[PDB]
Amino acid sequence: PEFMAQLYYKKVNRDRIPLQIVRAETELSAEEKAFLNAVEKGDYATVKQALQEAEIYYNVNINCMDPLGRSALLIAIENENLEIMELLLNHSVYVGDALLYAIRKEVVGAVELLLSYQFSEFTPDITPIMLAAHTNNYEIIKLLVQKRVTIPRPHQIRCNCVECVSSSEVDSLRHSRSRLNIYKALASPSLIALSSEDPILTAFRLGWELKELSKVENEFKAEYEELSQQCKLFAKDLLDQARSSRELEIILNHRDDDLAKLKVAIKYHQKEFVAQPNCQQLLATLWYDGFPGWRRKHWVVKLLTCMTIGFLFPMLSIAYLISPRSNLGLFIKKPFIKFICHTASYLTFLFMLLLASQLHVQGPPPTVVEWMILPWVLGFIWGEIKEMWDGGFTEYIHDWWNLMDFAMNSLYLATISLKIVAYVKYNGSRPREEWEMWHPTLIAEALFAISNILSSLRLISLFTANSHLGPLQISLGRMLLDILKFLFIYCLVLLAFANGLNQLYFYYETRAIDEPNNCKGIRCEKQNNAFSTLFETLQSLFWSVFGLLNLYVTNVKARHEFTEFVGATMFGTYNVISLVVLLNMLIAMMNNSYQLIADHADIEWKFARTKLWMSYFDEGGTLPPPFNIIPSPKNADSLIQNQHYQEVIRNLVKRYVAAMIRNSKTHEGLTEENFKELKQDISSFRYEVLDLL
Amino acid sequence: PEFMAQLYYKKVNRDRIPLQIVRAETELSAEEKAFLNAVEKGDYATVKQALQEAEIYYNVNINCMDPLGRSALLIAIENENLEIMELLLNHSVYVGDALLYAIRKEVVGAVELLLSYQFSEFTPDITPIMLAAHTNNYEIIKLLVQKRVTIPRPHQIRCNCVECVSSSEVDSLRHSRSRLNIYKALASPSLIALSSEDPILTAFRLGWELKELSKVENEFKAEYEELSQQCKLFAKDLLDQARSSRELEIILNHRDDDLAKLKVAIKYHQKEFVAQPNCQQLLATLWYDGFPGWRRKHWVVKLLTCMTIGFLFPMLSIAYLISPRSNLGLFIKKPFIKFICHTASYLTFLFMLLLASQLHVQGPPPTVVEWMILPWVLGFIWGEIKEMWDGGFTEYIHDWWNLMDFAMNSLYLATISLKIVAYVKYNGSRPREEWEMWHPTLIAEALFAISNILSSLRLISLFTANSHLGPLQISLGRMLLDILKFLFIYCLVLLAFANGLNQLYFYYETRAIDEPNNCKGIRCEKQNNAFSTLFETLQSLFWSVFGLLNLYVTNVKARHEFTEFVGATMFGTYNVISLVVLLNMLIAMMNNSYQLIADHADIEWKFARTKLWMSYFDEGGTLPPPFNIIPSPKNADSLIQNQHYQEVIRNLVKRYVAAMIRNSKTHEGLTEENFKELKQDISSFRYEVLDLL
Ligand SMILES: CCCCCCCCCCCCCCCCCCCC(=O)O[C@H](COC(=O)CCCCCCCCCCCCCC)COP(=O)(O)OCCN
Ligand SMILES: CCCCCCCCCCCCCCCCCCCC(=O)O[C@H](COC(=O)CCCCCCCCCCCCCC)COP(=O)(O)OCCN
Ligand SMILES: CC(C)CCC[C@@H](C)[C@H]1CC[C@H]2[C@@H]3CC=C4C[C@@H](OC(=O)CCC(=O)O)CC[C@]4(C)[C@H]3CC[C@]12C
Ligand SMILES: CC(C)CCC[C@@H](C)[C@H]1CC[C@H]2[C@@H]3CC=C4C[C@@H](OC(=O)CCC(=O)O)CC[C@]4(C)[C@H]3CC[C@]12C
Ligand SMILES: CC(C)[C@@]12C[C@@H](OC(=O)CO)[C@@](C)(O1)[C@@H]1CC[C@@H](C)[C@H]1[C@@H]2OC(=O)/C=C/c1ccccc1
Ligand SMILES: CC(C)[C@@]12C[C@@H](OC(=O)CO)[C@@](C)(O1)[C@@H]1CC[C@@H](C)[C@H]1[C@@H]2OC(=O)/C=C/c1ccccc1
Ligand SMILES: [Ca+2]
Ligand SMILES: [Ca+2]
Ligand SMILES: [Zn+2]
Ligand SMILES: [Zn+2]
C-alpha cells in the first residue's frame, strides 16, 4: 500500500500517524489548574482561599501560566473582574506586561488599578501609551497622558544617521515594526485630539508623511496608506463637527504662522476635508459673490446671464483697466465673473483660430486674423511666466495642464519665429508645389495647426467647473494612467513586430519612380513599401490597428510565395496580439479602473473644482488675455485669532469624541469576549450568593 | 539624526515627543468619580447614600460631568435604569437636554419620567419631537405628540423672504442643518403614520419635494435623496399592508379633492408604489378587460388572438364610429383591444411607407400610396394637437417620444408643403440629372425619407408593453444619458482635431474639375479634399471612426513630405484618442451604468408599462388613425369615500407599525449598548442582593 511517507515527521517513518507533543511545555498541576479554573469562573471565594493556602504552605504557584500563555492576572483582566484583580494585586502576583493586556482589552478600571499598583503577545517596542493610541480609546489614552509619557520621535524618510542605519542593518524587521508602531500611535485620532496644538494641521501633516512613507516603504504599504486615510478621515470628521458658519470661517481662515487652512488642505491633497459639504457651501458662497441666489435659478436664466457676461467681457476688462473702483470696475473681481470673462476670452481666441483656418507667397505678412491672434498669444505667454513668478517653479510643473500650456505657447513662439524668418528671408511669390520640404512657411503652418489642436483641447480643463462634465474629466484623467501602462507594452510589441517585418521586407524596397503614381509609402492610393524601412514599418503597424493598411502590402513584386506568406503571417500575428489581446486587455483594465474610481469620483471632482475656484479667488491674474499685457496706469491680532481657533478646536474635539463613542456603542455585532465576560459576571454572582447562603 | 521637527507641537521643538493635555479640562475628584462609577455599576445603595451625603454636607457635586460629557443622569439614562433615574430626579439633578438623550437611546420609560418631571451632543435647533421623529420610534413620537408639540414649517425652495435670506447670510451652515433636520423629522414614516390626514399623499409630496431639494441643494444631496427614498419606501410599504382587493380599490380610487391616487403616484414618479404587485395585479385586471384568462393562455393562442384583432382593427374602428353601443362598438373601448388596434394601425402605416419606398416629373401628383398615407399623417397631427389640448402643454413636452412625434409630424407637414409647392410651380417633365440641388421635389423626398426613419423608429416605444423588450428599452434609455455625456467631449475633441487638420490642409484645396471623376470630397471612389474645408474635415473625422476614410487623404498633390507626415500624425492621434480612449471610456461608462440600472430595471419597466397602460384607459383617443379625424355623428358621496379611505388608512397604519416593529425586533446583530445595559441589570441585581444579604 502506497503511503504518504513523511507528513508530520521525518525519522519516524506504518499505516498510522502517531501524534505527540513535539514542542512539549510544562503542564499545569492539579491544584494550579483548579486555581486557574476558579479564576476563570470568577468565584472570589476559593480564589482567595487558594491564595492564602499558597501563601501559607507554598503548595500552589500563584504565577502559574495557562499553557496558552494566560496567567491568573491575565484571566482576571480578560474577565473584566476588578475584585479578583485587586485580590491578586494585593497578593503580589507577577504584573509584567499586564498593563498592555488591560489596555488592549480596554478595561479602564484595570488600567487605573495597574497604574496605581517570558512570553508576551506584544512586541518588545510596544509601550503602554503606544498601545493605548493603537486601541484609540480616549479614556485610556487620556489616563496615560496625565502621567508624563513620551512617544519616540520618528526619523525622516531620507534620514541616513548612524542610529537609523545601524538599526536597519542589525534588525530591519524590528526597525520597520517600531517605525510602523510609532506612526500608528501618532496617527491615532484620539491621541491627535489630545496632545496636539493644531489637530487639523497635525492630521494634514501626518497623512502626507504617511502617504510618502507608503510610497517609499514598498513593503508594509497598506498599513501606511490606511494610516494616512485614518488621518484624512479624522480631519474630515473634525470639520464635520462644525455647528455654525462662524466656527467654519474660524477654522478655514486660520493661519498657523483668507482660507489659509483650506489652502493648506489643498496643498496636502486632503480631498475628503476639502469636499466637506459645509466647506463646499462656503466656497460656493464666495464663488457666486455677485449672485446671492444663483443656486435657485432656472437653467435658461443661468445660460442667458452667462452669455451676457461673456459678451460683456471686453467692457468689463477695460473698466477694470481704467477705473478698478466703480460699479463695473470691481465687477470682474468676482470669482465667477472672472471665470466667465476668461472663458469668453478663450472662446474668442478659439473662434479666431477657426477664422484663421478659413497661397503662393513665400513668407507672407500675417493677415488681420493672425494680427488679432498675436495679442492673445502674448497674453498667454505673459500669464504663463507670471504664474512661474508668483506661484513658483515647483507648483507650476506639478500641473499637467501647465505642461500642455507650455507646449502650446512654445509652439506658438516657434510659429511666430518661423513666420518672421520666412518674411525676412523670402520675398518672391513662388508656387507652393516647388517649395522645399523644410520650407519655413510649411513648418510654421504645421506648428500653428498643432498649436490650434492643443488650444482647442485645452477646453477640457473647463469641464471641472461643471457638475456633469467634472467627474467625467476626472474619470478620463484616472484612466489615462492605464492608457500609458498599456501603451508601454503596446510599443514594445510594435517594436518587436516592426523589427521582424522590416528584417523580412527590406530586401524588396523599391524606388518611388517604379511606383504607379511616383508615390512611395502607405499614404498612397496604392499602398506600397509598407515594411521597406523601420519608420514606415512602424507607421504601417500603427495604421493596421485601425484597418487602414491593406492586405496586399504583404506581397512583394517577385514571386516569393514563402516570403510573402511569412510576412502575412507576421502581420496576422501582430493584428491578433495587438488588436484582440492588447486592446481588449486595455478595455478590461479601464473597466476595472472605472469601478475603482466611481466610488471616489465625487470627492475627486469636488477637490479639482475647489482648486479651479481658488485659482480665481486671488487678486492677481484677474484680467484675461489680451488685457493682461496692457500696462495699467498704476502680534496681538494674531493671538486673538489663535485663541478663537483654540476654542473652536476644543469644541470640535469634544463633539468628535462624543460622536466617535456613540458610533462605537451603536455598532451592530457582539464579539464572544462580551459573552464570556457576561458569563463571568453571572458566575461570580452565583458563587457569591452560594457563599452568602 | 534627522527628525520630524514638528508633528504635534510648534514651539516645543529632542528625540522624543512629550505628551500633555493641551486642551486641559476640569478633572473629576475622587468622590465624584466614585459616585459616577456607582451610577455606572447601577448599585442603588451607595448612589442614594452619596446623594444624601452631598445634600447634607455639600461634599459632592451631584451634577458632576464625566470628562466625556456624561453626567449621572446621562449615565442612568444610558444604562436604562429607571430606579436610579427616579432617585436622581427626586434629588433635583440638572435635567437640561436629558430628554434628547433619552429619546435618542429610545427609552420609553425614561421619556415618560422626564416628561412628568454646557456641552451637548445635539445641535441647538433639535427639539424633542424632531429628534423623536429622527429616531422613528412610534412610541416616543406618539407620547410627544399627545402633548401639544409643533414642527416649524419649512420654507419653499425658491423662497426669498427676509427671514430666509437673513438666516442664510448670518449662518448658512445652521440654516442648512435646521432645514435638513426639519425635513428629516417630517419624512419620518412613524410621524407620517400619525399626524397626517393622508399618509400616502403626504409621502408622495414629501418625496417629490425632497428630490427637488436634492436637485437644488447641490451639497447635502445624499441626505435629501435618502429622505425621498424613505418616503417612497413608506408609501410602498403602506400599499404592501393591503390585505384585500376592496382596500386596494379604496386606496387607488381615492380623490383628495378612477385610479385617482395611482395617477397622483405616477405624477410624483412613485415608481416603487406603482410597481407594487397588488397594484400591478389590479392594473392587469383592468388591462385585460375582454379576456378574463389571458394570463393562463398558450403563446400560440395569444399570438393568434393578437393577429386576429389587428386584422379586425378597421371593422372595430368603424363599429365604434357608427354604433358605440353594440357587441363590437365598445369592444375597442377595452384598453388591450385599443392597444392592439393602435399597434395594427401604426404597422399598416409603416407597411404603406415601405410600399411607397417601392421619375423625371418636376412636382408629380401624389401616388395612390401617398394618397393612402395622407389620412394617417393627418390623424397623427390631429392626435398630437388633441394631446396638447387635453393633457396640456407641460405634460406633453415632458415626454421625449412626444418630441420625436413632433419632429416626425413637422417633417411630414414640410414634405406635404414642398410637394404642393413643386406641383404648383412645376409642370414639365425635366430629367432628374439636370434638376437644381435645392429642387423642391428632392427636398420633399429627403424629408419624407427622414420621416419614414423616424416613424419606423417610433416602434421602440411599444417595447414597453413586452416583458422582455421593456427592461431592454429602459436600459437603452438610461445609457443614452451616458451617450450624450460622452458625445459632448467627443464633439470637443472632434472640433479640436478638425480645426488643426483644416488649418494644415486648407492650402491644398483643389477644384472638382482637377479630380479624376469631377468628384470632390470623401464620398467619391477616390477620396480627396478630406481636410480642405472645415465641414468636410468634420465629416472625414467622423467617418474615420468607422474606418471609411482612407489613409491616402493625408497626402497632398505637392511633394510636401513634412506637411503630409504632420497631417497623418494628427490623423493618427485623433484615431488613437477618439477610437481607443473615448470609445472604450464610453464602453466602461455604459458597463457601470448597466450594473447600476439592473437592480432597479424591473421597477422602472413596470412604471413605464403602467404609464403606457393608463394611456389607453381614458375614453378619449380610442380611435387610431386615420379614424380619429372622421367626425362622429354625435358632497355626501365624497364624504363617505373619505371615511372609507380613512378606515382603510387606519388599518394600513396599524399593520405597518406592527410590521416595522417586528422587522426591527428580528434584525440580526446586537450592539454593545445592549451588552452594557445587560451588565447594568446584572450588577444592580448583584448589589441589591448584597444589600439585602
Ligand atoms: C511631429 C508632428 C506631431 C503632430 C501631432 C499633432 C496632434 C497632437 C495632439 C496632442 C493631443 C494630446 C492628448 C491630449 C489629451 C488630453 C486629455 C486630458 C484628460 C484630463 O482630464 O487629464 C487632466 C490633465 O490633463 C493633462 O494631463 C494635460 C494633457 C496634455 C498633456 C500632454 C501634452 C502633449 C503636447 C504634445 C505637443 C506635440 C508637439 C509636436 C511638435 C487631469 O488633470 P489632473 O491634474 O487631475 O491629472 C490626473 C492624471 N491621472
Ligand atoms: C440634414 C439631414 C439629416 C438626416 C438625418 C437622418 C437620420 C435621422 C435619424 C434620427 C434617429 C434619432 C435616434 C433615435 C433613437 C431612439 C432610441 C430610443 C431609446 C429609448 O427607449 O428612449 C426612450 C425615450 O425616447 C426618446 O428620447 C425619443 C427618441 C428621439 C428623440 C430625438 C428625436 C430627433 C429627431 C431628429 C429629426 C431630424 C430632422 C432633420 C431634418 C426612453 O423614454 P424615457 O421617457 O423613459 O426617457 C429616458 C431617458 N433616459
Ligand atoms: C461641443 C462643441 C459644440 C464645441 C463647443 C465648445 C464650447 C462652446 C463648450 C465646450 C465645453 C463647454 C464648457 C464646459 C464647462 C463649463 C463649466 C460650466 O460651469 C458651470 O456649471 C457654472 C456654475 C459654476 O461652476 O460656478 C460653465 C460652462 C462651461 C464653461 C462650458 C461652456 C461651453 C463650452 C466651453
Ligand atoms: C423586427 C422586424 C422583423 C420588424 C418587425 C416590426 C414589428 C412587426 C414588431 C417590432 C416590435 C414588435 C412589438 C414589440 C412590443 C410589443 C408589445 C407586446 O405587448 C405584450 O406582450 C402583450 C401583453 C400586454 O402587454 O398586455 C405586444 C407585441 C408588440 C406590439 C410587438 C408587435 C410586433 C412588433 C411591432
Ligand atoms: C499618435 C502618435 C503618437 C503616433 C501615430 C503615428 O503616426 C503615423 O503613423 C503617421 O504616419 C506615429 C508617427 O506617431 C507613430 C508610428 C508608430 C507609433 C508609435 C505611432 C504613434 O502612435 C502611438 O504612439 C500609439 C497608438 C495606440 C494606442 C493604443 C491602442 C492602439 C494604438
Ligand atoms: C496568427 C496565426 C496563428 C494565423 C494567422 C494566419 O495568417 C494568414 O492568414 C496569412 O495569410 C494563419 C496562416 O496563421 C492562419 C490561417 C487561419 C487561422 C488559424 C490563422 C492563424 O490565426 C489564429 O490562429 C487566430 C486568430 C484570432 C484570435 C482571436 C480573435 C480573432 C482571431
Ligand atoms: Ca497655465
Ligand atoms: Ca405623442
Ligand atoms: Zn536617523
Ligand atoms: Zn423664507
Neighbours of B48 (CB within 10 A): 17
Helix (H, G, I), strand (E, B) or coil at A528: strand
Q: Using an 8 Å Cβ cutoff, are A275 and B220 in contact?
A: no
Does A540 contact chain B (CB < 8 Å)? no
CA B306, B311, B315: angle at the middle one, nearest 5? 120
What DSSP element (H or E) covers B211?
helix B199-216
CA distance B396 to chain A (A): 20
Buried b (16+ CB within 10 A) or exposed e, B632-657: eeeeeeeeeeeebbeebbeebbebbb
Q: How many C-beta neighbours within 10 Å does residue B146 have?
A: 10
Look at residues B522, B494, B528, B525 and name the one whose alpha carbon lies nearest to residue B508. B528
User: Dihedral (C-alpha) A99, A100, A103, A105: value to the nearest 10 degrees?
Assistant: -110
> Is A528 in contact with A553 (CB distance < 8 Å)?
yes
Distance A595 CA to ligand 1 centre (A): 24
- Amino acid identity of residue A578, one-letter, is S
With contact defined as beta carbons under 8 Å apart, do B404 and B454 qualify? Answer: yes
- B341 known ligand binder: no
Residue of B nearest to A435 (CA): B560
Whether A625 contacts A380, CB under 8 Å: yes
Give the integer Cα–Cα distance in Å for A571 and B324.
Answer: 73
Report angle CA A365, A368, A374 to the nearest 5 degrees: 85
DSSP A576-644: IIIIIIIIHHHHHHHHHHHHHHHHHHHHHHHHHHHHHHHHTTSSTT-SPTTGGGS-----HHHHHHHHH
Around Cβ B277, how many Cβ atoms within 10 Å? 10
Please report, to the nearest 10 degrees, the dihedral formed by the alpha carbons of residues B148, B154, B159, B165 taken in order: 90
CA A499/CA B237 separation, integer angstroms: 69
CA angle B537, B542, B545 (to 5 degrees): 130
Are A331 and A290 spatial neighbours (Cβ–Cβ below 8 Å)? Answer: yes
Instruction: Quote the CA–CA distance of B71 and B98 in Å, as a whole number.
Output: 10
**Grid cell listed for A168:** 536597519
User: DSSP of A147-201, one letter per residue?
Assistant: S--EEEPPBPTT---HHHHHHHHH-HHHHHHHHHHHHHHHT-HHHHHSS-S-HHH
Residue B326's CB is within 10 A of a number of other CB atoms, namely 11
3-class secondary structure for A340-391? HHHHHHHHHHHHHHHHHHCCCCCCCCCCHHHHHHHHHHHHHHHHHHHHHHHH
Tell me how long chain A is.
693
Bond before B189 cis per omega within 30 degrees:
no
Nearest-by-Cβ selection for A591 from B67, B219, B588 = B588
- Which DSSP category does B11 fall into? S
Distance (Å, whole) CA B313 – CA B133 = 57
Long-range interactions of B168-172: CB distance < 8 A, separation 24+: B169/A292, B170/A245, B171/A244, B171/A245, B171/A246, B172/A245, B172/A281, B172/A282, B172/A285
Resolution to 1 decimal, in Å? 2.5
Torsion angle of the four alpha carbons B494, B496, B499, B504, in this order, in degrees rounded to the nearest 10:
-100
CA distance A523 to chain B (A): 4
Nearest-angstrom CA–CA distance, A573 and A580:
10
In angstroms, rounded to a whole number, what is the distance separating the alpha carbons of residues A482 and A592? 10
CA B487 from chain centre, in angstroms, equals 23
Stated as kind and residue range, the H or E segment containing B18 is strand B16-18
How far apart CA B351 and CA B456 sit, in angstroms, is 10
Output A351-357 pairs: Cβ under 8 A, ≥24 positions apart: A352/A376, A353/A452, A353/A455, A353/A456, A353/B499, A353/B503, A354/B499, A354/B534, A356/A448, A356/A452, A356/B503, A357/A452, A357/B499, A357/B502, A357/B503, A357/B506, A357/B534
What's the rounded Cα separation, in Å, for the pair A254 and A232? Answer: 18
Q: Which neighbouring-strand residues pair with B16?
A: A152
- Binding site feature residues of A: 155, 159, 161, 164, 384, 387, 402, 405
Rounded Cα gap, residues A459 and A151, in angstroms: 51
A650 → chain B, closest CA residue: B23
CA-atom Rg of chain A in angstroms:
37
A320, A326, A331, A333 alpha-carbon torsion, rounded to 10°: 60
Nearest in space to B215 (alpha carbons), one of B157, B292, B168: B157
Of A151, A161, A654, the CB nearest to B19: A151
List, in order, residues 6 or more apart from B403 with CB less than 8 Å away.
B397
| Percent helix / strand / coil, chain A, rounded to 5 | 70, 0, 30
B411 in Cβ contact with B457 (< 8 Å):
no
Q: At what angle do helices A245-252 and A277-287 cross, to 10 degrees?
A: 80
**CB-based contact B338:B622 (threshold 8 Å):** yes
Binding residues of A for Ca(2+): 384, 387, 402, 405
Amino acid at the residue A255: R
**H or E element in which residue A566 lies:** helix A561-575
Q: Which residues contact A399 (CB under 8 A, 6 or more apart)?
A: none
CB-based contacts of A247, cutoff 8 Å, min separation 6: A648, A651, A652
The answer to whether the peptide bond before residue A277 is cis (omega within 30 degrees of 0) is no
Cβ neighbours for B151, distance < 8 A, ≥ 6 positions apart: B127, B129, B130, B133, B182, B185, B186
| B180 interfaces chain A, CB cutoff of 8 Å | no
Q: Amino acid identity, residue A71?
A: S
Are B581 and A476 inside 8 Å of each other by CB?
yes
Distance CA A339, CA A290 (A): 12
Which of the listed residues B489, B493, B494, B570 should we mutate to test ligand 1's pocket, taking the one with most ligand atoms within 8 A of CB? B570
Distance of CA B690 to the CA centre of its chain: 62
Report the candidate in B326, B206, B202 with the shortest Cα–Cα distance to residue B256: B202
Q: Residues with Cβ < 8 Å from A138, sequence gap 6 or more?
A: A190, A193, A194, A657, A660, A661, B68
Q: How many helices (H) and strands (E) does chain B have?
A: 30, 1
- Rounded Cα gap, residues A6 and B158, in angstroms: 81
Contact between residue A507 and residue A524 where contact means Cβ atoms under 8 Å apart: no
Query: B79 C-alpha vs ligand 2 centroid, how far in Å?
Result: 63
Instruction: Check if B287 has its Cβ closer than 6 Å to any atom of ligand 4.
Output: yes
* C-alpha cell belonging to residue B56: 447634607
Q: What are phi and psi of B227, to 5 degrees?
A: -65, -45
Beta strands in A507-551 (DSSP E): none
Q: Which value, to the nearest 10 degrees, does the dihedral of the CA atoms of residues B150, B152, B153, B155 take? A: 180
What distance in angstroms lies between residue B558's CA and the mean position of ligand 9's atoms? 68
Whether residue A307 contacts residue A347, with contact meaning beta carbons closer than 8 Å, is answered with no
Residue A603 grid coordinates: 470627492
Report whether B531 contacts B504 (CB < 8 A): yes
CB atoms within 10 A of CB B158: 11
Tell how far CA B449 is from the center of its chain: 36
Rg, chain B, Cα only:
37
Q: Residue B283 C-alpha to ligand 5 middle, in angstroms?
A: 59
Q: Which three three-digit cell numbers place residue B466? A: 413586452
CB contact under 8 A, A653 and B2: no
CA A393, CA B137: separation in Å to the nearest integer?
60
Return the C-alpha torsion angle B195, B201, B204, B208, nearest 10. -80
In degrees and rounded to multiples of 5, residue A668 shows phi and psi of: -65, 140
Name all residues whose Cβ lies below 6 A of ligand 2: B 399-401, 403-404, 407, 450, 453, 457, 460, 473, 476-478, 480-481
Alpha-carbon dihedral sign for residues A436, B554, B525, B497: negative
Give the span between the Cα atoms of B385 and A230, in whole angstroms: 62
Please give the single-letter amino acid code of residue A692. Answer: L
Its sign, for the CA torsion B53, B58, B59, B62, is positive
- What is the experimental method? cryo-EM
Q: Residues A254, A645: contact at Cβ < 8 Å?
A: yes
The three cell numbers of residue B604 are: 422602472
- Give the Cα separation of B235 and B488 in Å (integer): 39
Q: What is the grid cell recorded at A618?
A: 486671488
Q: CA A688, CA A43: separation in Å to the nearest integer? A: 7
Ligand sitting nearest the alpha carbon of B175: 10
Residues 6 or more apart whose Cβ sits within 8 Å of residue A306:
A340
Q: Which of residues 426-455 of A touch B (CB under 8 A)?
A: 432-433, 435, 437-438, 442-443, 445-446, 448-450, 452-453
Dihedral pair phi/psi, residue A435, rounded to 5°: -70, 155
A572 in contact with B, Cβ within 8 Å? no
Q: Are B42 and B687 in contact (CB under 8 A)?
A: yes
Distance CA A34, CA A676 (A): 19
Residue A284 near residue B218 (C-beta atoms within 8 A): yes
How is residue B16 annotated by DSSP? E
Rounded to an integer, what distance in angstroms lies between the CA atom of residue B95 and that of residue B544? Answer: 77
Rounded (10°) CA dihedral B613, B616, B619, B621: 150
**What is the torsion angle, in degrees rounded to the nearest 10, for the CA atoms of residue A293, residue A297, residue A303 and residue A309?**
-20
Is residue A274 within 8 A of residue A610, CB to CB? The reply is yes
Gap between the Cα atoms of A367 and B503, Å rounded: 14
Question: How far is residue B131's CA from residue B101's CA, in Å, rounded to a whole number?
Answer: 9
Compute, in angstroms, the gap from residue A179 CA to the centroid of ligand 9.
11
Burial track A364-386 (b if 16+ CB lie within 10 A, e otherwise): eeeeeebebbebbbbbbbebbee
The residue nearest atom 2 of ligand 3, judged by CA position, is B492
Whole-number Å distance between alpha carbons of B255 and B244: 20
Q: Which residue of A has its CA nearest to B23?
A: A650
**Cα dihedral B206→B172→A602→A306 (10° resolution):** 100
User: If you measure CA to CA, which chain A residue comes closest to B488?
Assistant: A469
Q: Smallest Cα–Cα separation from A110: which of A78, A147, A138?
A: A78
As a 3-state breakdown, chain B gives helix, strand, coil percent values, each rounded to 5, of: 70, 0, 30
- Residue showing cell 507648483: A395
Q: What are phi and psi of B151, to 5 degrees?
A: -110, 125
Is the separation of the CB atoms in B557 and B508 below 8 Å?
Answer: yes
Query: Which residues surround the ion ligand 7 when the cut-off is CB under 5 Å?
Result: A 402, 405
User: Are B67 and B28 in contact, with CB atoms under 8 Å apart?
Assistant: yes
Cell of A316: 468689463
Residues in B closer than 8 angstroms to A437, CB to CB, are 559-562
- Contact criterion met (CB below 8 Å) for A643 and A307: no
Closest by Cα among B473, B462, B536 to B506 = B536
